[PDB]
Amino acid sequence: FRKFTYRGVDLDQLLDMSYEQLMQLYSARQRRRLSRGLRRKQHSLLKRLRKAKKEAPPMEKPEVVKTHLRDMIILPEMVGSMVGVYNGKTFNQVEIKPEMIGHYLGEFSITYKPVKHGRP
Amino acid sequence: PRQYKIPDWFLNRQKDVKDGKYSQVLANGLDNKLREDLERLKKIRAHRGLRHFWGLRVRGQHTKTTGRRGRT
Amino acid sequence: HRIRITLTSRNVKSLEKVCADLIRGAKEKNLKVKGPVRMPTKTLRITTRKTPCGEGSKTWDRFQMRIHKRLIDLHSPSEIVKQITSISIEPGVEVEVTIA
Amino acid sequence: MLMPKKNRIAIYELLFKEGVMVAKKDVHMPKHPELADKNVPNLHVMKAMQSLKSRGYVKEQFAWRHFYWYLTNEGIQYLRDYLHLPPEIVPATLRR
Amino acid sequence: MAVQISKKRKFVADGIFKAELNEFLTRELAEDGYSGVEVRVTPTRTEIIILATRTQNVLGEKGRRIRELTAVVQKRFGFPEGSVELYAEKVATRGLCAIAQAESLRYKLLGGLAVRRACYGVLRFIMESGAKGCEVVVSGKLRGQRAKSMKFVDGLMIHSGDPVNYYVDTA
Amino acid sequence: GHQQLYWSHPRKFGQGSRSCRVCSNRHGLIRKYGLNMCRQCFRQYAKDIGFIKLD
RNA sequence: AGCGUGUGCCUACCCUACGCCGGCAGGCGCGGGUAACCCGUUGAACCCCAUUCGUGAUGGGGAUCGGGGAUUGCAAUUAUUC
RNA sequence: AGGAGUGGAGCCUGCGGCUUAAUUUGACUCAACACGGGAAACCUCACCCGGCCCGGACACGGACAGGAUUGACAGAUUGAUA
After folding, report:
1. Which residues carry this modification: N-acetylalanine (chain E)?
2. Which chain H positions come under 7 Å from a protein C-beta?
3. Which domain does F53 fall in, by range?
């Protein structure tokens, strides 16, 4: 019900914010990932999100975009996106919610199915 | 503890995910703050959160040989 | 004048006969000679499984290569050296002449 | 093997000026320890000279990571007409 | 020198150097009777002697092959131009050098000669050559599918102890 | 371009970067003393390099 | 204490003293060592001396797990390690 | 005669089993099971899902400079500015 707040700042204030203060906003592993820099193979994914987001009618959630990049940080721009994260066999569509900020896309694309020993 | 000149790196809850306030949590808030982050990782359907939902090792231990006691 | 000569060799006696050969030419020149400084030897240890595969009882090896080194330094100009250095040197011994 | 002809003419006369040239077996090597003046990708050079013995102009030998192309007497005559050089010159291994 | 590697690494390096020559020459000069090499140190000059049975057969036509071999060692190892030289000396009492007698035997069976007939011809030959005793063991598939092993031995021949290191040479 | 996915993945470290100088495999390699020779290719060349099974 | 090891043909990658910053991991400067030379007189633990605890799953034990901070790497989520 | 243990506990790791797109595989009394020097994030890698390339010499028949035949940023495609 209440607004989502990340360390004490709400969603709309994240998006209009540069990265130099976004590093010290959250975890050490993530800020070192951004302090080390991104790759053009990864920048090419971000533009594919805005390309998929402005092409969405305002009452429809945007188009599905697929990727093999399980090693991408959920930064507050990717909110509201249908990413087809690759498992290794298939692309499982998951919708980014604001609560997934600061994690990897691979975390929500399970690679194995859970085991159940009884009842074949 | 803050105004009593206690450093930030002593606190069991540093940089909270909601309020980001460096606080120490004490024995009643501790366990309720312990099922908030657990259920937060479950609603987002994170792999780390589902491992708690299933009762498995989450920090990436080999479950093939150990962890048998509660598992009948 | 204070020049240093290094004698490193894998074989001991082939070093010993060279470490004594430079002495034959230096007292030939009748000048003050430094005694052959015996340095502590270095042994190169390599232990590996005898087996190409990973089967059988676990047995190992003890491949070594004990290297020896001797130092002799002389108070002599350069031309007196390079006439002695070129006499009766065996391939197993490596000489290192240090002018300074 | 659609690699530039400017790389053939160079290596054949590199093969002529010296009776034999070495090349370590490494397809992921843009360079050469000997032919370091220009690009001349290594994976093209070995599979250029294997087209020399498939016809029968050179020899072969291996040294755990290395090729040795000894061109034959029938190979030097192939150099005189293919790169058009006079019959006066012979490789450095034919001159004492 | 340039990078100045340590004393431990250099002595290991020339061991790798001498190793790669022996194999390269064993794969190339065997049919001309290659029997090992030896390096002799000299400032800016490394002469390597190729001890071979047929010295006239390793020079080829007008000493060309020795010039063909000095070329590859000049490019493979990156030795400076005119820094290293090769020679071709005769193997004394070639009947005693084991690796000389194994490759000589290797070409008899490869000629199609009988496995028994070949073994006696090389075993008694090194007997008139003045040996103390020898053992020629030929394994592998013989007289069918299942592999057996002939072991043709004569004379005095020891196995254990330290003397095996310098009284016996194997091939 | 095909050359950007043929060797563009960095091989400046890891087991896929070093290889035996004889056996050319990536298992049992002796990187000590700068050998870069696998333990199996090392054994038959143990003595001509100069190592001795002394004691 | 005693075994060792240490800047790499390809090789892009060493072992570290000292001075500063930080609780820590670590970071920033400067130098030494291709090594009986510098790390390094290798100030290692155990042990020894002196406090606290007091037979209590206890200051025994440190599994599991939360939050945070670093380092290596193109990349760590199925937590690389710290 | 004894010492210290293992078997019990937690954890590490190897094997079987089960599970799985795949959970690569070798070895099963001594003489298999911290063994393949096997401490696998990529690589390794042999497995699985996909996706490029020919790095199919050589010889023989057509096609071919009136061109046989390589590479190429755009847009769509793709994971990838293959």
Report:
1. 2
2. 9-23, 26-27, 31-32, 35-38, 42-45, 48-49, 51-59, 69-73, 76, 78-82
3. 1-55
